[PDB]
Design a protein around this ligand. Structure first.
Ligand SMILES: CC(C)Oc1ccc(C(=O)Nc2cccc3c(-c4ccc(CN)s4)ccnc23)cc1
Lengths: 247, 38, 289, 238, 247, 38, 247, 38
């Protein structure tokens, strides 16, 4: 026989181990493969699909109403319209998104984000918005001439309905962490703010109030690392009829 | 290491790096341009 | 200049010198260079072919041995009346708690390594019935994942956390964790603050956060209590090290900081690191016959 | 050769007639971040001569009772000139440094200063469990004083501090010290307001002494940032 | 199957073992390597850096004062100035040095040492010193014409501030031991002594008292062997907040 | 012996005998001579 | 994984096993080898060195006196002088010899022996001896004309001081045993006897009594087999200071 | 079978059959003859 000795970790059950194991049904022939539409091979393909942000996460916004932001004509120049918290770990407009939900199975992330906004007013409605990303370090800007100093796009409503703001990967480290300490220097991304560049201008027969839908996706420079249990789901009890499977 | 006679007994296959994200991101019959899309 | 060094250097024989303008024993410490005087220049030498290896002072060999990083004892019992580690504990992973490993790591400013982890479990009966061969679950909980609240909470179902299940009768459980810093190296020291506000922790780089180790006994409690002790050992491997540092002299006070007090008197007092001798002319262990 | 030196960076120049060579920390020279190490994808600003020039700090008086002095980088420069303005308007910074320390006395004076650049000089507090606070660390342009230079204020050792990049000013020998520091961080860039890569420490291991008539003997620090890059433009924190 | 038998040492945990072990995080990609200044690959590179000796380890020398030796003008010829104990294992001027601290992680040592002394008097101060190494066997020499018989350097103060005394490796065995019995024939190195070769001579306007700083390093013929726990550090209790990591 | 799929699982790498002690002993811009240094 | 099964003898500690085992001190460099005089590689080299027989193992022979045999002038012809028991296992003149002591670590032996005798009388002493080896089977011969029938050498004292009697390997089996039953047919070697061939003849000024020193060695046809604990040493208690090693 | 990295870990080396018994049996400067030795 072969002389052998057992190492530390002999007999352990590691849930991420990767070995062959004994086939319980010998000579079983699985059903032939068939082409099915929509095969996924990397989860990064899913986070590249844009999905609606819950920007109007306010009391008295119910259900579908939380997925849109209403804009009205103002009488003061350059007013703030809304801001978007960029925390994916803490609860906020980005959490329940395809990029958000998949990323919360991971601990580390890197790469650029795109926010796309679709204007859903009438054809006769006109306006210009400025959308700003502020890199981290200070407070969220409350005035347009402060927010204008960051990365921004000036959006004119027109035949093309939608504009993209890229949030470029601007970070000291290779990765950020999905950290519950949102103010940590390893976690904070900064802010997105929207201001009036001009005004929403509508004729009498159009509705005086118009909506934006915001979407977010990852770009293909995006990467995720260190898999973890997602905090999005849990159970305190057995589910209904889970017991009946033993009966 | 796999001495079992059935190929489904083997360890996991972590080597498939093929992607095609456009089947979810760009399912439009006429491809986008880098240029007014409509 | 960089070179492959496998053995200590040879000595060459040397003659009498007496050369004007050549003074190899004089140096200038103010430049910050160390003395370049060779032995052959200071004295007459013979030839020595030197066969002494240098492999035991390789940084890989100096650091890659397993050291205790965590040690926790808890009661394995019916806990309904306890106020305590109720058949499980949580540990926030760190290298600062046991001073022998801490001092060795703190010889360097930056380290990159993978961590070989060995988990050793031992059990004693509470005050005999024999010792139960319990099953333990260790679960790694990264940053932002939920830690278990109870021995039987559904967090232990471990859908995506890495868990290892191991018996007390087994050899120690062993796994490797990769180098997992968000930077290219761990910051062994950090002259900085962890958050964008002024109240964040000094001295800990947020980039080096590992996570939590959660360990439960998987068995239900027995009718009698036991004390279970878990010991965690870490061995660095595949090591790179940068910027060597002056070693720690004063006793460590805290895992959170470099705070210092010193011993009450020398050795290793704040006023006197070396123990005293009667005078600079006193030889303490002088040979006399 | 080794005794006289001129340093010219931007609109600034320094001459010394009593150098003791100079130190390049770990044998490196400052450089800009190459593309194969870069993380942040926005195009950096590289102000060159507006930032990469000597700034002179306030002088400190060498006294018989001095414990030594320290300054943290970039903290000491974060409010000075165009370097400070770029620091305040940008999230990310990277640079090397040229450090030049100046102290002259007569041929009848004696004294020796260890001039040492410490990477990641994480300070300890004495005789407490509480970690040093923000105002204990962030001294800015004025710098700090050593409490216990014998342990480098970090439970460690002045005697072994020669493991760091250093020179001496031995008043008999020389009257200036020069250290060139590369970028020294675990990340390719950093937020300049919450982390210091380098601490300059000047410690009088041999005290100032003479029997001539006494004069004020100042120590002066001039620092040039080198190869400054800034990323993540926004409003000024300031 | 393969016939096998277990050897003695099966199932042991040896803290210096060297095996592969199961990866807990499969497919994890570590952060790309980046060039950092000052990589160390052998600890012998550190012990070659000279560091200050605590020669003035006397009561009433406090803190920094212990790292220098003060020299004064004498009125008797050829007087002894100081001696240096060469025990690295027993507490003494060499212990808290880079060569000292690293060597105390090891049991066996071989090779030459250099001591460098920097004169820190004024420019107008003059003098000659003799620095002697005595190989072991007898008592430390107390007179110059006894110490002069050993290995020595005669140092004239001048424009070059500093002199080296080499302590050459003179030993019967390949290695010495860091032995607590300092008088053991496997451990004792002998002595370093400093005498006046002439006198310290200074004018009235220079300070009458001058200092030496002594430094020690290993040479590159130096070798260390048999790793051990260093006696330089220990703990009797848990550290502050070490418990809080479990809370 | 390493049958794991991740290379970080391997045993220790004790073969790197490259040294450059001059980066700590001789960080002077003009190299020392074997000759008055100043 | 590899399918395996454990054999009988798995987990045993056999004191003569021969396996590699885990190095406790990794990367340790042993001291370079140095040439030392007198390397031994086979214990048969030692048993080939002749060493004194304790032939005078009698009461009233003390210490050194036991290593010599005294011969005197006789007045009867052809008298017996001494006999040598050839038992190496049982206590006798051969036991405390180099061949004897090493052989008692073994159970089986084969090959020829040499006995050498040195005459240590004065130069003026003369004489002839006959030394006889008798192969086994009967009693030890008590008369010269019986002993003369075996293997023998007739030794004349002269300028060459010493004579060899070879005991040739004469055995039915390949090996004999070191058996406590000395009369066993697998063990008994027979006898060596010494008789006067003429007489010891000395002048008045020489000492009337002279000594022989007998030596024995193995020849190089000699072989040893089956290692055992030698019965030459034992302990009933701990040695002095063996306890102090735990204190 | 030896998978350890240190060569001193190996099993015993029972193959050295070189002998020179004359260094103990014949250390005389002039060799013996097979012939009166003195
Ligand atoms: C449950 C099982 C499947 O997974 C695990 C996961 C982890 C452990 C465990 O204790 N690791 C560990 C214990 C102690 C230290 C570490 C380190 C460090 C490197 C540099 C540091 C300075 N800050 S710290 C990194 C990864 N790990 C560590 C044990 C088991």
């Amino acid at each position: 026989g072969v002389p052998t000795y057992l190492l530390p970790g002999s007999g352990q059950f590691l849930t991420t181990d990767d070995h062959s194991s004994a086939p319980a049904l010998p000579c079983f022939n699985p059903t032939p493969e068939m082409h099915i539409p929509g095969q996924v091979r990397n989860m990064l393909e899913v986070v590249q699909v844009e999905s609606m942000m819950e920007i109007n996460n306010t009391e008295s916004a119910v259900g579908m109403e939380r997925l849109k932001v209403d804009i009205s004509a103002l009488t003061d120049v350059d007013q703030l319209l809304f801001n978007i918290p960029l925390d994916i770990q803490l609860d906020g407009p980005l959490r329940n998104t395809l990029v958000g939900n998949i990323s919360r199975y991971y601990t580390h992330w890197s790469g650029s984000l795109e926010m796309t906004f679709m204007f859903c007013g009438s054809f006769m409605a006109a306006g210009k918005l400025i959308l700003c990303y502020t890199p981290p370090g200070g407070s969220c800007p409350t005035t347009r001439e402060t927010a204008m100093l960051g990365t921004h796009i000036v959006w004119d409503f027109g035949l093309q309905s939608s504009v993209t703001l890229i949030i470029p990967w601007i970070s000291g480290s290779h990765y950020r962490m999905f950290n519950n300490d949102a103010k940590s220097t390893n976690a904070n991304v900064g802010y997105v703010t929207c201001f009036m560049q001009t005004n929403l201008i509508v004729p009498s027969e159009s509705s005086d109030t118009c909506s934006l839908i915001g979407f977010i996706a990852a770009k293909d420079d995006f990467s995720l690392r260190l898999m973890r249990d997602s905090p999005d789901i849990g159970q305190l009890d057995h589910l209904h009829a889970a017991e009946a499977a033993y009966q | 290491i796999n001495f079992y006679k059935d190929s489904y007994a083997a360890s996991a296959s972590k080597q498939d790096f093929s992607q095609d994200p456009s089947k979810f991101t760009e399912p439009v019959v006429e491809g986008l341009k880098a240029a007014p899309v409509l | 200049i960089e070179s492959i060094i496998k053995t200590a250097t040879d000595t060459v024989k040397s003659e009498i010198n007496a050369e004007l303008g050549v003074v190899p024993s004089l140096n200038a410490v103010e430049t910050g260079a160390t003395s370049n005087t060779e032995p052959e220049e200071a004295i007459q030498t013979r030839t020595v072919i030197n066969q002494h290896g240098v492999s035991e002072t390789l940084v890989e060999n100096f650091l890659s041995r397993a050291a205790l990083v965590s040690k926790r004892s808890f009661e394995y019992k019916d806990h309904t009346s306890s106020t305590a580690d109720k058949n499980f504990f949580k540990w926030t992973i760190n290298t600062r708690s046991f001073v022998q490993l801490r001092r060795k790591l703190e010889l360097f400013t930056y380290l990159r390594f993978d961590a070989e982890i060995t988990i050793l479990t031992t059990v004693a009966v509470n005050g005999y019935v024999g010792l139960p061969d319990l099953t333990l679950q260790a679960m790694f909980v990264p940053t932002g994942a939920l830690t278990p609240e109870k021995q039987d909470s559904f967090h232990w179902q471990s859908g995506s956390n890495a868990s290892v299940f191991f018996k007390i009768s087994d050899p120690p459980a062993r796994i490797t964790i990769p180098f997992m810093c968000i930077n290219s190296a761990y910051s062994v020291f950090y002259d900085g603050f962890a958050g964008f506000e002024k109240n964040g922790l000094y001295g800990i780089n947020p980039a080096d956060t590992i996570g939590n180790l959660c360990v439960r006994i998987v068995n239900e409690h027995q009718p009698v209590g036991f004390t279970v002790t878990v010991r965690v050992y870490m061995k660095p491997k595949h090591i790179k090290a940068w910027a060597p540092r002056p070693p720690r002299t004063l006793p460590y006070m805290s895992i959170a900081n470099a705070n210092y007090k010193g011993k009450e008197r020398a050795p290793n007092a704040l006023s006197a690191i070396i123990g005293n001798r009667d005078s600079v002319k006193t030889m303490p262990h002088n040979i006399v016959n | 050769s080794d005794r006289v030196l001129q340093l010219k960076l931007g609109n600034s120049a320094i001459v010394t007639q009593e150098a003791a060579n100079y130190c390049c920390a770990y044998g490196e020279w400052p450089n800009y971040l190459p593309d194969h190490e870069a993380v942040a994808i926005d195009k950096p600003t590289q102000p060159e001569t507006a930032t990469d020039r000597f700034y002179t700090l306030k002088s400190v008086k060498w006294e018989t009772g001095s414990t030594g002095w320290w300054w943290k980088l970039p903290d000491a420069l974060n409010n000075i000139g165009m370097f400070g303005q770029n620091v305040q308007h940008h999230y990310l910074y990277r640079s090397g440094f040229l450090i030049h320390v100046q102290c002259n006395a007569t041929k009848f004076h004696q004294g020796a200063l260890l001039v040492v650049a410490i990477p990641e000089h994480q300070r300890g507090a004495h005789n407490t469990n509480t970690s040093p606070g923000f105002d204990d660390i962030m001294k800015g342009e004025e710098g700090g004083t050593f409490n216990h230079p014998y342990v480098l204020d970090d439970g460690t050792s002045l005697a072994c501090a020669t493991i760091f990049p250093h020179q001496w000013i031995n008043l008999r020998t020389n009257n200036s010290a020069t250290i060139v520091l590369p970028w020294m961080n675990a990340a390719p860039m950093d937020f300049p307001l919450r982390h210091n890569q380098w601490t300059l420490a000047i410690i009088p291991v041999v005290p100032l002494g003479t029997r001539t008539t006494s004069s004020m003997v100042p120590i002066t620090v001039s620092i040039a940032p080198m190869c400054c890059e800034f990323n993540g433009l926004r409003h000024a924190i300031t």
